Each structure stands twice: as structure tokens, then as C-alpha cells.
Amino acid sequence: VQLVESGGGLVQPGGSRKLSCSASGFAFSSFGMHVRQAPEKGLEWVAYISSGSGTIYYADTVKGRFTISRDDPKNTLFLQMTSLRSEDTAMYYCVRSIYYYGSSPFDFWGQGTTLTVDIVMTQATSSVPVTPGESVSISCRSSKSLLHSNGNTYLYWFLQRPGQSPQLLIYRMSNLASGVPDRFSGSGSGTAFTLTISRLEAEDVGVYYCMQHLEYPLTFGAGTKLEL
Amino acid sequence: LLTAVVIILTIAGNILVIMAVSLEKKLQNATNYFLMSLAIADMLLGFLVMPVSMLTILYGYRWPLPSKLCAVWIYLDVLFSTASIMHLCAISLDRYVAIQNPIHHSRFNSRTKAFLKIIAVWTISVGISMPIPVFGLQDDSKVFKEGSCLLADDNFVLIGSFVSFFIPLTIMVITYFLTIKSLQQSISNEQKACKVLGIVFFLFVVMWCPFFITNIMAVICDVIGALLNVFVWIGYLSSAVNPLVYTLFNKTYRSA
Amino acid sequence: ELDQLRQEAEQLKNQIRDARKACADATLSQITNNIDPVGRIQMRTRRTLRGHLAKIYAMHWGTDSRLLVSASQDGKLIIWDSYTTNKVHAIPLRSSWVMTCAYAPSGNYVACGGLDNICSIYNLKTREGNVRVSRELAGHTGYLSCCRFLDDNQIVTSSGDTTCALWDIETGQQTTTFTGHTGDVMSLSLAPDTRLFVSGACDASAKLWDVREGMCRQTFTGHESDINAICFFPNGNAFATGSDDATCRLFDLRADQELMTYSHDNIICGITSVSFSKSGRLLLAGYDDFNCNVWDALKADRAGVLAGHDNRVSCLGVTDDGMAVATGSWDSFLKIWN
Amino acid sequence: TVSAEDKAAAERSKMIDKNLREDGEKARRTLRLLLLGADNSGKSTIVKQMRTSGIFETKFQVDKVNFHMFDVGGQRDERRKWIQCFNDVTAIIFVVDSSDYNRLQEALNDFKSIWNNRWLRTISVILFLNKQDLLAEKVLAGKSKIEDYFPEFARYTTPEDATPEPGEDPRVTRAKYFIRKEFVDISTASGDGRHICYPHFTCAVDTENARRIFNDCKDIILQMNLREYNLV
Amino acid sequence: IAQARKLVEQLKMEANIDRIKVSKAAADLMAYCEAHAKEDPLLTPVPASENPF
Ligand SMILES: NCCc1c[nH]c2ccc(O)cc12
The missing domain is CATH 2.60.40.10 (Immunoglobulins)
Structure with a gap:
């Protein structure tokens, strides 16, 4: 049970970058996948992709320019970013979650890759x-x-x-x-x-x-x- | 009056068929769902257009109802009659497929078969009847003839009869012929199936075919109107017999 | 030689019958005569769980009174969530012939058995979010008929080779073998104390076993044919059997003799399942008349009928807290009553 | 007033229902058969060109149609409890050996029991009469006599109306038709008409036997369709 | 052949069992049934506010 991630590095503002999270060690199609962390701030939710790509949600901060798809045969899910801004520098976490009666979502988290550029x-x-x-x-x-x-x-x-x-x-x-x-x-x-x-x-x-x-x-x- | 018994017989028989389908748990299938849709179509016919036609008879074809409701009465008549005819055509086609190759029919025989068949016949019945209400409510000249409700637009009449009865007739003649050709101790049951198929097909032809033949011959050419006035009610008699000849061959409907 | 043994056995059987009859002084009917009846009750199906496309043979309520598992002929063993009526898991089975299932008291194991002679245990709560086969217990020479978890690590099975066994999961081999019957064993029911259980066989006899030693303690023979299902009174000192003679019977452990029989002339069909209510005052049943019955456990008066299935009722279970009743049938729908 | 986890759980249940729908839709395409015989009948060798102690399985295809034939050899003589499962199968296949006359009555009683079952009032049976070559040699030998076992064979009506195979012994034809009529009498004694029997004569080495089962299952399904369409 | 010895030994072992009066057993049964009369959701109806179905 692992989650490895790829992509990051220096990016000029207004560009585009693709983050890919490759899962290896569990049934990937049965889990709903989600979370970024600024350099000196707590975790902030980013997006969510459901099981079988049947439902997608985004945070308002990243609506309209972040897109998610998942290659179930390849056992991998991506995150496409366009029109990056100076304040999106963070570390993006690949997170799993499974929802049924008695489940324990958010039970495993990815390694995290650095990228540099409502209930309260x-x-x-x-x-x-x-x-x-x-x-x-x-x-x-x-x-x-x-x-x-x-x-x-x-x-x-x-x-x-x-x-x-x-x-x-x-x-x-x-x-x-x-x-x-x-x-x-x-x-x-x-x-x-x-x-x-x-x-x-x-x-x-x-x-x-x-x-x-x-x-x-x-x-x-x-x-x-x-x-x- | 002879038309007074037909409305009561239709409204009683279709309610009995729908109540027998709803009450008997053994009659829950795709074919019986299609037959319940057929009974719904003829019950809507016998409730909506048949006492209106009796009222037209009792006033001597001078229409008592006001002129705004003529284009919807032809709409309901053509819609429910085309629904009944396409129901019988789809039943004949399904019987040919289920008799010619019974393995491959039962391989694909889901409830999606029944729902797609109902969707197809009601979509066809809506789409064929489509120029009736849009071109009749404001344009009274195309749906009136000498102060009576009739389809004066013969360009609608010829093509509509061609798509509504005569192409179903040339489909059901071919499927009946090939079903008799495919039914030639199961040999004892095949004779009863052949007799029921023959009675149903020739009763459909006898009930509906005089009206459409004289209706087309009206546009090709007061004897014709006097023939049409009784051939319409002969056509309405099919909607009271279609529950009987499609259910009484099975003893579960008689026990209900 | 053997004739002397048969003579001694017959004499001892007569002695046992006389001793058992000597302790019968007053029947339960004349004692319970002056009791206010329960009147009339009506229970309507509260939920109907669809998703099976074939007959349903067995089911078992979970301990949390919300989850249940059911087994069908299509080869799928799928777990429901009663309150919201979802599906928690769907487990594909190697063998389509499945006749028993059980839900572990801990709630993280499920057992399955049928004509394949193998009891398969499934681990529900695990990493990588899928239900994999934990173990395949084998060693029965006849078809498995019932299985019940004792604890997380032990399970008791009743097979179709005239014997029951008590397995140890981690070792994967039997630790006890109950072999006292002469016919096929069809049912089984643990006790609330989980120290002695009972079984039912096709020889019209039920045996009260012990899980520590493995020796039959008592036998009850009052049925005219094979007994199909068995329960246990919540007090733990009685149980109810069900045979294809259309007669349920109530047996006691301490008295060692039948107490009451539930019969009626309008019914001549078989019985598939029986269960008790929370207080034991109500004895449920499941018949081949495409319906169920509710028997008053103290008067044998039919105080309810649950007719909602167009086919026979195969399995029946009462919730642990007693909030609801769930019955499965061969029409591929199992409905919850309350 | 709905939690996100409940939304996701409902979505998961929808996906599970979709998978169950797809699997059940796929699983219906194939037909199901139950093969059973008393003993010494060679029921295993019914189909041999095309091809877990409790259950035995066999899968064969003819004209793009899949058949699963289920044989159980790990059970006792009394089979009244595990036969309730086989009530939705297409047809039961019954195989008997007419070579051995000493145990014909046992097979006839077994056929009586399976015909008059309470859970099999809607399943039709396909009857096979195996090992006709050995029957031919035995009757041509002239050692065994049928009157000793069956007194009704001594006075039997000539099957003039029934067409025999072109070129054969009249005594062999008389004996085999007598056996088949004995089976058919029990088949028709109930007179219910809900289901029927399909007798067949089988050789020890017979290349084609799946075609026979196909042509009887097609008839079974056709009769079911005729009954359900209110044409009978 | 020798199974009769095992059968009679089992019957002898099961012969010596203590028993009670059926009146006492019935009294205990009714006592337990009436002790939990108020704790039976199926014997007594419940309002929809508490019913989870
Ligand atoms: N009573 C109207 C019968 C009918 C059914 N379909 C039709 C099509 C054209 C037409 O003129 C008439 C019809």
C-alpha cells in the first residue's frame, strides 16, 4: 500500500503543470481520492474525485482551472493545473478515502511533492x-x-x-x-x-x-x- | 342504442384486465406489461373519444361541443387508435421472434425489451399524430367539413393511413405468414397457437380494415360518409375485443 | 450376544421413558390458562431490499442491529445497511451452490457454506478495501448445512454427513467432532452463554451438545418427520424446533421433555425457519404457504400473519435488540418487518 | 441536511448495483441442465467431444449457445433436500441402462419419484436409454427372457403404426419400444400436461448428443413462450 | 457389528440426568417472559420518533 507522486519544481506564473499520483498496493478503483499544504500554513483542501469518476468537487479557490482524471487500468490519478498564480506554492498530498457504513476515510496519505512558483x-x-x-x-x-x-x-x-x-x-x-x-x-x-x-x-x-x-x-x- | 353497450363493455373489460394484471402475481412479465399498456390505450379511447362520438351520433353529426375542442378530439382519436394498431403490430413482431428462434429471444428477453417496446410504440403514436393539434386549433378549416369534426385535409389522411395502418398491415401479414410457416406432443399445442393467431389476425383485419379502405377511397374519389359513420364504430369495437382475444386464451385471466 | 445388548437397551429405554413421564404432573396449558392474551398485532414491511436476481437461501443479522448479510443462488454474498438500505459489500463466490451464511459477533468476519463441502470465511475489515477469502475450512464429507461463529477464532458447523464440528480458524483444522446423529444434520443454534448448543437432523430428533467435552447431553424425540430449523429461548433453558409436519414444538433443557406444540388444521405445509422475540413471548415461524406466522409462546394461538412473499420464505431472523424482523424468500426480495 | 459521507456511500451502492446488473445480465445468456442417473448407466459419457467432490461441472457449446450440465456424485442415495435448488434449470437429463433387466424397476421407481416431486412441477425431463447395443446382443443371444420379469411382454401389441428403423430385428424393436412405452406410461399417467418427457435412444459410442439436447431445449423454450403469450 | 456396544454405552451415559417438575419449568418460563414484557419492541408498538425504520 503506497502512493507515489510526480511533478513540481520551478514554474513561472500563468503557466501549466501536471501532477500525477500513482497508486501501487491496493484496489484503486474502489476508493475515492482527494489536499495541499503551504510552506508555513496548515493543510488546505483542494479537490476530490469519486469512485469510477462519478462525482467531482473542487474548492472555490481552485475552481475552473484545476482538472482531475484517473486512469483506473493504469492505477493513477492526475491533477492538471492552468493559470498558476504566485500564491499556489504548496505541497500537494495524494489522499485515499472509502465511504461505506463503518468506513475510515482519509486513512492513507501520499508522500507529497513540492510545487513552487463554509464551516470555519x-x-x-x-x-x-x-x-x-x-x-x-x-x-x-x-x-x-x-x-x-x-x-x-x-x-x-x-x-x-x-x-x-x-x-x-x-x-x-x-x-x-x-x-x-x-x-x-x-x-x-x-x-x-x-x-x-x-x-x-x-x-x-x-x-x-x-x-x-x-x-x-x-x-x-x-x-x-x-x-x- | 347499440353504442350504449360498447362504452360500458370497453370500460368494464379494460378495468378488469388491468385489475387482473395488478392482482394476480403470476401475470407479472414483459408481455403482460405490454398488454396492460394496450388496455390503458383502449381504456383512454373508450373513456375520452367514445361518448363524444355517441354524443355526435345523438345530435345527428351537428357537433354540440364548441369549436375549440375539435382539433384535440381528432388528436385523441388518432393517437389512441395508432397506439392500439402499433401495439398489435409490435405484439405480432415479438411473437414471430419468440416463435421462430426461441433460444435467442429468451437470451435477450429483459424488462428493457418491454420498456423499449412501449417507448417505441408511444413515440410513434405521438409522432404520427403530430400535425393534428398544432394545425387545427387556429386553423379550423382543415379539421371541419360542413360544420362537423372531420379530417378535411386529405393530404394528411392519405399519408397518415399509409404510415398508420397499411405499413403495419404489410408488416403483420408477413409476420403472420412466417409465424404460420414457423409453426409447421408440442404438435397439439402448436395447433391451438395457430388457431389463436388466426382468430386474432383475421379479427384485427375485419375490425380495422373496412374503415381505412373506405377512408382512402374517400380521398381517391353520400354513401361514403354513411359507410364511414358506422365503420368508425366498427373500428371502436376492436378496442373492446382486444382485451378478450388476447387474455382469455390463458386460464389465469379467466380465474381472476 | 447382541440380543442381550438389545434387550438391555430396550429395558433402559423403558426406564428412561418412565422416569421422564414421572416428572410430568401439570401441563403448561392449565398453568398458563389465566393469563391476559396478547390480543391482535399487525406488522407491515418497513423496508424491502432489492439487488438479488435469484433465490435467497440464508441470512444473518449483525450484532449492531443494522447490518445483515444474505446468500443467494446467483453466487453473490452481499451485505446490506438496513436503515438506509444500501449495499456495503458484494463478495463473488467461487461456488454458486450456497446454503448457509453467518455474520461474526465482532462484525469483521463472514462465513459461507454450501454443496461444495467447504466453509469459506471472509475478512471484511482489511487494508486495500476489498474482501478477500481469509480461509477455506475443509474436512466434511457431506454438504454444509449451517455455520455459526462462536468467537472471532472459532466456528461451529453442521454438515450433511451426520455430524457437526467445531473449528479453530487460525490452525484451520477441527478441534472437536460431534457425531451422535443417525440422519442428515440440517440446522444448529448456539446458546446465549456460548457454552452449549443444540442441533437438528432429518431423523426427527434434536440433540443438546456441549462445546467443551463434545458429548451429547440430552436428546428430544417428539417429531413425526425431519426438523428443518431450530432456535434457542433467550432464557437459555428452552428452544423451539420446526419440521415439515406443519408443527413447531417447544422443548426444555432442564425438564428434558416437550412442553407445547404449535399446530393448526388450516396449515399442512412445511416449516423453514423459526425465531424468538426479545422477551420470548412471541415465537415466529416461516412456512411453505408463501407467508409466515406469529405464535404466542404460552398459548399456541396464532396472533399474527405476515403474508408479503409470492414464493416460500426460506430464512428468518430477529434483530438482537428486537427492533425489527427480517425474512428472506425465493422471490429474490428479503423484507424487514416491525 | 445530508452528510457528504452518506452521499458517497449512496454513490458506492449505485456503483455496486450497476456491477450486479452487468454481471446478472451477462450470467443469464447460458442455459442450465441437471444430469442424474441411478447407477451403471454411463451418464458421464453422454457428451465427450466437448468438455470439489460435492459438485461436478461440465460446459459445452453448440451453435453459439452455452450449456452448464451439473452432476452431483458426492451425495447419499436420499436426495430430497439438495434437489430443491434445481427448480429453475432448463431441463433434467435422466439416463438409464436398459441392458440390465434386474434393476429396471429401481430406475422406473426413481423416475416416478422425480416426476411426482413437489418442487419439479414445472421442469421437463429429457430421458436417455443408454447401452442399446448390449441390449441387442442380450436379446439376440436368447438366454434372458422378459416374461420372467415383465409378464406383460408375453402378450404385446405389434407396433405396426410406429415406424421402425430401416433394417432391424422385429424382436429387438418390440423389446425397445416396450421399454420406452413403459417409461412413457409413467410419464403420462399424471396427465397434468404442464411438462413432458423427451425419450431418446443412445448408443455406447455416439458422436452427436449435444444436438439432441439443443433441439429439446429449443422445444422447451418455445413451449414456454407459447404458454406465456396466451396462445395455449 | 460392534456399534451396539457404543450405542448402549451412550444411552447408559445419558440415562442418569437430573430433571425438574414441568410446573417449575413453566413457572420459570412465564417469569422470564413477563420480566421483559416492557423491553420487547415487537410485542408493544413504538412511536415513529423513536422507531429507526
Ligand atoms: N378514428 C381515427 C382513426 C385513425 C387512426 N389512425 C389514423 C390515421 C389517419 C386517419 O385519417 C385516421 C386514423
Whole structure:
């Protein structure tokens, strides 16, 4: 299970560049594929291509000039960019997602390739000094309620180590991802979400992002850095 | 009056056929869906155009209804009659395909067959009848003759009879001939199938063919009008018999 | 020599019958006479799950009371989402002959078995988002008739070679073999405590097995023909059987004898499935009359009929919380009732 | 008031329905047959030019039509429970060996049981009478006598109306027609008319047998179409 | 041939089993059934507000 990406480098403004993400290790046709990161800013959603290319969504910032297609026999999906501007410099992440009852979307992320040229969510914390072996909590507020009529609260927690792609920790505010140790725990109510860590130890220091999946466009949080 | 029984017989029989299709679970198939569409077409005919024709009879062909509604009565008459005729033509063609090569018919026999057949016959019935309401509502001279509702536009009449009855007649004669040629202890059931096919085909020819022959001979040439006045009601009698001769050969409809 | 053994067996059988009859003093009818009846109930099909193009043979509710799996003759084993009526998975089967299926209590495994003599276990939750065959358990000399998960790692099977087995998935080989029947084994039902189960065979007898030792404890013979389906009372001290004589029977484990039989003259057709309600007061059933029935478990009064299938009802299951009832039939539609 | 994940799940279910539709549409093209016989009948060698203990499978094509013939040899003598599955097959193929007279009554009783089944009131049967050469040698030998087993053979009506094969022994013709009429009597005793039997005489070495099954399945489907079109 | 010994041994093993009165068994059954009378969504109807179907 891998996702490799190609393309990037210096590009003059107003030009065009093609990013290709080649998947190798999973059933590519059964997954819906999605996310960029500026040099000094948190993750920002870009676009989304469904299963079998049956549905496409874009963020308003990249509407009309970004196009996506996927070669299912080739096991690869692309991103065509035209009329690039000076503010689109970022690192683009190839992200998978599968949607059925009990699924865990956004469970794997690509490596990321550098390219250089609405629900509002805020995370109040910016930098929290922490001691090893000390329980901590991270909160992420919301504008409107995420609790749906059916009873699912659509909120996600992602973690990025330094020099690494982010990964899923908690999906739908309570359920744990696969391979995540039990110390991580999510709880709260509508419009108030907390991530609690107990027996915090090394190799757990990074940037924590909170995302909503109630409706498009998908908006991330500002992020919270942890430091010793 | 003789026309008083025909409206009641048509409205009763078509309601009975549709209720028997809806109620009996064994009669859910493609062919019975097409037959329900046929019964819908003749029930709309017997409900919409047939008491209007009785009213025209009871006033001595001086039309009581006002002049704005003449172009839609010819529209409903031609639409439902062409729907019935193309229904019988498609049924004859389907029977020829299902009798000549029964393996390859059942290989392709989805419900898409029935839905495409219904779509084709109703699209054809709409498209053939298309110059009736657009050219008759404002232009009363083409749909009136001496103060009575009749198709005075004979250029419509000849070509419309040619596409509506005579090309279906030359299709169903060929398919009936080749179906009898393809049906020549299954030998006992093939005789009953041949008898039912013969009764249905010759009853269709006897019910519809005098009216169209004298209708074309009207445009080629008051005896003709007096013949047409009763041959229209002979043509309306087919829509009460078509539920009977297409369902009563199967005992499930009689048990319903 | 063998004549003496037969004489001793007959004498001991007479002794057992006399001992079992000595404990019958008052029948359940005269005890339950002064009870307010349940009256009349009506349940309408709330959802109808389409997608199968062939007969449906078996189904099993999930533990979360929302997901269920069903098996058909077309060779597809597909999982539904009851509330929204979607399809979660569609698993292509190597053999088109499938006669039993089960949903694991953990919710991440599904079992399948049929005329191919092999019980196939499918892993649902896995990486790369596809359902791959976990293991193919083999070792039965007759067609598999029923299968039920004990835990994540063990499964009990009832085969068409006059025996049941208890498998260990990781090792992939049997750890116990239940061989007490004389006819074909057709059904099986675990207990709520998951320490002893029961089985049903074509010899008109049901046996109460034990999963620790593997020795039959009790046998119940009161049916005039093969018993097609079996359940377990939620109390865990009784169960209900169903045969092709159009008669369901209620048996008790402690009393070791039949308690009540559910029969009516208007019905002379076979029974395919039985299940209990949440409190056990209602005993459901599934007949060959293109419909179902609802039996009062304490009075044997027909207190409901669920006629919604144009073909026979093959499988039937009650939700764990008791919110709904789901029945599958040979008309390729399985409908949920409430 | 709909979540994006529910939208995507509905789209996934639509795609699954599309795949199921396509697969089911493809799977209907082929016809299905159930081959079964008592024993010592050579049911395996019915078709040999064209060609998992519980189930045996055989696939052959004639004139672009696919047939799946299903034979089960891993079951017991009592088959009343696994036969409910085979109720939508095109036709059952029955093979018997007329060479052995000692066990003819067993095969006749088996035919009675399969004819009078409750789940097979709509399936027609294609009957095969295998190993006619051995029957010919046995009857020409003059050792075995049919009156010992069947007293009704001693007084039998000459099949004058029935046309025999051009050039053959009258005693052989009498015996084989007697056996076939014995089968057909049970076939027609019910007199229901819903389904019929298709008797055939088979040689030990017979190159063509799929054509016979094709011409009987075509008749079966034609009769079904005639019945469903209200022409009968 | 020798299966009769196994059969009679099994019957002897199953002969010695404790039993109770059918009245006591029936009383326990009705007690359990009436204990969960209010916890049966099929025995008692439910309003549409709580019904998930
Ligand atoms: N009563 C109108 C019968 C009819 C059916 N199709 C027609 C086409 C042309 C025409 O003049 C008449 C018809």
C-alpha cells in the first residue's frame, strides 16, 4: 500500500503543470481520492474525485482551472493545473478515502511533492509546552454543529510528525484508526471537540489537525504544535 | 342504442384486465406489461373519444361541443387508435421472434425489451399524430367539413393511413405468414397457437380494415360518409375485443 | 450376544421413558390458562431490499442491529445497511451452490457454506478495501448445512454427513467432532452463554451438545418427520424446533421433555425457519404457504400473519435488540418487518 | 441536511448495483441442465467431444449457445433436500441402462419419484436409454427372457403404426419400444400436461448428443413462450 | 457389528440426568417472559420518533 507522486519544481506564473499520483498496493478503483499544504500554513483542501469518476468537487479557490482524471487500468490519478498564480506554492498530498457504513476515510496519505512558483474551524492552541509522561488535551472549536440527525458527528483528527505526511488518528470523533495506540481518545459534544492523550511519550510530537466532513468544502483547523 | 353497450363493455373489460394484471402475481412479465399498456390505450379511447362520438351520433353529426375542442378530439382519436394498431403490430413482431428462434429471444428477453417496446410504440403514436393539434386549433378549416369534426385535409389522411395502418398491415401479414410457416406432443399445442393467431389476425383485419379502405377511397374519389359513420364504430369495437382475444386464451385471466 | 445388548437397551429405554413421564404432573396449558392474551398485532414491511436476481437461501443479522448479510443462488454474498438500505459489500463466490451464511459477533468476519463441502470465511475489515477469502475450512464429507461463529477464532458447523464440528480458524483444522446423529444434520443454534448448543437432523430428533467435552447431553424425540430449523429461548433453558409436519414444538433443557406444540388444521405445509422475540413471548415461524406466522409462546394461538412473499420464505431472523424482523424468500426480495 | 459521507456511500451502492446488473445480465445468456442417473448407466459419457467432490461441472457449446450440465456424485442415495435448488434449470437429463433387466424397476421407481416431486412441477425431463447395443446382443443371444420379469411382454401389441428403423430385428424393436412405452406410461399417467418427457435412444459410442439436447431445449423454450403469450 | 456396544454405552451415559417438575419449568418460563414484557419492541408498538425504520 503506497502512493507515489510526480511533478513540481520551478514554474513561472500563468503557466501549466501536471501532477500525477500513482497508486501501487491496493484496489484503486474502489476508493475515492482527494489536499495541499503551504510552506508555513496548515493543510488546505483542494479537490476530490469519486469512485469510477462519478462525482467531482473542487474548492472555490481552485475552481475552473484545476482538472482531475484517473486512469483506473493504469492505477493513477492526475491533477492538471492552468493559470498558476504566485500564491499556489504548496505541497500537494495524494489522499485515499472509502465511504461505506463503518468506513475510515482519509486513512492513507501520499508522500507529497513540492510545487513552487463554509464551516470555519479554529484551534485556539498554537504551542503548548509539555512534559514526557504527562497527559495532555487538544481542543478544536467549530462554527456550526457537526452532529447529524442520524447521530454521526463528522469530525476527524490528523497527526503530522516533522518531515512526514499526516495520518488519520480519530474518525468521526470517537473511533480510532488502525494501528493507532489506545492512549489516543476523542470525546466532546456538538461544537466542542477534545483529543485527550494519556501516558504521553516520545515519537508523539507533531502538528494536530482537525477536519470536518459534514459538507464540502472540507475545512481543516489551524493546527497545534507540541514542544518539550 | 347499440353504442350504449360498447362504452360500458370497453370500460368494464379494460378495468378488469388491468385489475387482473395488478392482482394476480403470476401475470407479472414483459408481455403482460405490454398488454396492460394496450388496455390503458383502449381504456383512454373508450373513456375520452367514445361518448363524444355517441354524443355526435345523438345530435345527428351537428357537433354540440364548441369549436375549440375539435382539433384535440381528432388528436385523441388518432393517437389512441395508432397506439392500439402499433401495439398489435409490435405484439405480432415479438411473437414471430419468440416463435421462430426461441433460444435467442429468451437470451435477450429483459424488462428493457418491454420498456423499449412501449417507448417505441408511444413515440410513434405521438409522432404520427403530430400535425393534428398544432394545425387545427387556429386553423379550423382543415379539421371541419360542413360544420362537423372531420379530417378535411386529405393530404394528411392519405399519408397518415399509409404510415398508420397499411405499413403495419404489410408488416403483420408477413409476420403472420412466417409465424404460420414457423409453426409447421408440442404438435397439439402448436395447433391451438395457430388457431389463436388466426382468430386474432383475421379479427384485427375485419375490425380495422373496412374503415381505412373506405377512408382512402374517400380521398381517391353520400354513401361514403354513411359507410364511414358506422365503420368508425366498427373500428371502436376492436378496442373492446382486444382485451378478450388476447387474455382469455390463458386460464389465469379467466380465474381472476 | 447382541440380543442381550438389545434387550438391555430396550429395558433402559423403558426406564428412561418412565422416569421422564414421572416428572410430568401439570401441563403448561392449565398453568398458563389465566393469563391476559396478547390480543391482535399487525406488522407491515418497513423496508424491502432489492439487488438479488435469484433465490435467497440464508441470512444473518449483525450484532449492531443494522447490518445483515444474505446468500443467494446467483453466487453473490452481499451485505446490506438496513436503515438506509444500501449495499456495503458484494463478495463473488467461487461456488454458486450456497446454503448457509453467518455474520461474526465482532462484525469483521463472514462465513459461507454450501454443496461444495467447504466453509469459506471472509475478512471484511482489511487494508486495500476489498474482501478477500481469509480461509477455506475443509474436512466434511457431506454438504454444509449451517455455520455459526462462536468467537472471532472459532466456528461451529453442521454438515450433511451426520455430524457437526467445531473449528479453530487460525490452525484451520477441527478441534472437536460431534457425531451422535443417525440422519442428515440440517440446522444448529448456539446458546446465549456460548457454552452449549443444540442441533437438528432429518431423523426427527434434536440433540443438546456441549462445546467443551463434545458429548451429547440430552436428546428430544417428539417429531413425526425431519426438523428443518431450530432456535434457542433467550432464557437459555428452552428452544423451539420446526419440521415439515406443519408443527413447531417447544422443548426444555432442564425438564428434558416437550412442553407445547404449535399446530393448526388450516396449515399442512412445511416449516423453514423459526425465531424468538426479545422477551420470548412471541415465537415466529416461516412456512411453505408463501407467508409466515406469529405464535404466542404460552398459548399456541396464532396472533399474527405476515403474508408479503409470492414464493416460500426460506430464512428468518430477529434483530438482537428486537427492533425489527427480517425474512428472506425465493422471490429474490428479503423484507424487514416491525 | 445530508452528510457528504452518506452521499458517497449512496454513490458506492449505485456503483455496486450497476456491477450486479452487468454481471446478472451477462450470467443469464447460458442455459442450465441437471444430469442424474441411478447407477451403471454411463451418464458421464453422454457428451465427450466437448468438455470439489460435492459438485461436478461440465460446459459445452453448440451453435453459439452455452450449456452448464451439473452432476452431483458426492451425495447419499436420499436426495430430497439438495434437489430443491434445481427448480429453475432448463431441463433434467435422466439416463438409464436398459441392458440390465434386474434393476429396471429401481430406475422406473426413481423416475416416478422425480416426476411426482413437489418442487419439479414445472421442469421437463429429457430421458436417455443408454447401452442399446448390449441390449441387442442380450436379446439376440436368447438366454434372458422378459416374461420372467415383465409378464406383460408375453402378450404385446405389434407396433405396426410406429415406424421402425430401416433394417432391424422385429424382436429387438418390440423389446425397445416396450421399454420406452413403459417409461412413457409413467410419464403420462399424471396427465397434468404442464411438462413432458423427451425419450431418446443412445448408443455406447455416439458422436452427436449435444444436438439432441439443443433441439429439446429449443422445444422447451418455445413451449414456454407459447404458454406465456396466451396462445395455449 | 460392534456399534451396539457404543450405542448402549451412550444411552447408559445419558440415562442418569437430573430433571425438574414441568410446573417449575413453566413457572420459570412465564417469569422470564413477563420480566421483559416492557423491553420487547415487537410485542408493544413504538412511536415513529423513536422507531429507526
Ligand atoms: N378514428 C381515427 C382513426 C385513425 C387512426 N389512425 C389514423 C390515421 C389517419 C386517419 O385519417 C385516421 C386514423
